[PDB]
């Protein structure tokens, strides 16, 4: 992130009352050999980041200097997606009833280990091995 806008991103999470667009685009590029017009089935699962929420205060400290903040993203990792040959990664409703609150609790961890060496691990609220390998599912069509 460009330094001035990184400081502005900081500020948003720090104070700036805005809602960061957390578009979790779930692009599913298939193929065209077996068919699949718009193979890439994509859906930006956005999470408007409430100004300085629990998640954004964790992100405030994340971008302040520390790298030990588990950012709570309220169940936003679709664990069952009815994707077809069109451009939509729409999750199965009922599989995930709330489908925004029944996806899968996802967490984020920026690992700025100055040596800032800013990495970014996508953890889970219950990360067992899903900090390096998140296992969701795509109900393909």
């Amino acid at each position: 992130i460009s330094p001035p806008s990184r400081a502005q991103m900081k500020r948003e999470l720090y104070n700036g009352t805005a809602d960061i667009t957390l578009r979790f685009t779930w692009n599913f590029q298939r193929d065209l050999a077996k068919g699949g017009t718009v193979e890439y089935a994509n859906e930006k699962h956005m999470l408007a980041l409430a100004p300085n929420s629990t998640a954004r205060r964790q992100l405030a400290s994340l971008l302040e200097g520390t790298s030990d903040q588990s950012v709570v993203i309220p169940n936003l990792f679709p664990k069952y997606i009815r994707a077809p040959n069109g451009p939509e990664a729409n999750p199965v409703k009922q599989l995930q009833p709330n489908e925004e609150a029944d996806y899968l609790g996802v967490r984020i961890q920026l690992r700025r280990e100055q040596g800032f060496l800013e990495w970014w691990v996508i953890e889970l609220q219950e990360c067992r091995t899903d900090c390096n390998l998140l296992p969701m599912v795509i109900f393909s069509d």
Binding site: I1, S2, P3, P4, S5, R6
Partner: protein, 48 residues
């Protein structure tokens, strides 16, 4: 990216109204058609 509104479209059309074909392009394209290219210029991405 800003989908230009009806009022915004009028502005562009009037800006280039002297030139007939310029205005024509804008006016012919339906409102909420002409989109705004607000391309980001800030970097951060160093180069390689």
């Amino acid at each position: 990216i800003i989908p230009f509104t009806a009022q915004a479209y009028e502005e562009l059309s009037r800006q280039f109204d002297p030139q007939p074909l310029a205005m024509q392009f804008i006016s012919q394209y339906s409102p909420e058609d002409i989109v705004t290219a607000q391309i980001e210029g800030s970097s951060g991405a160093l180069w390689r």
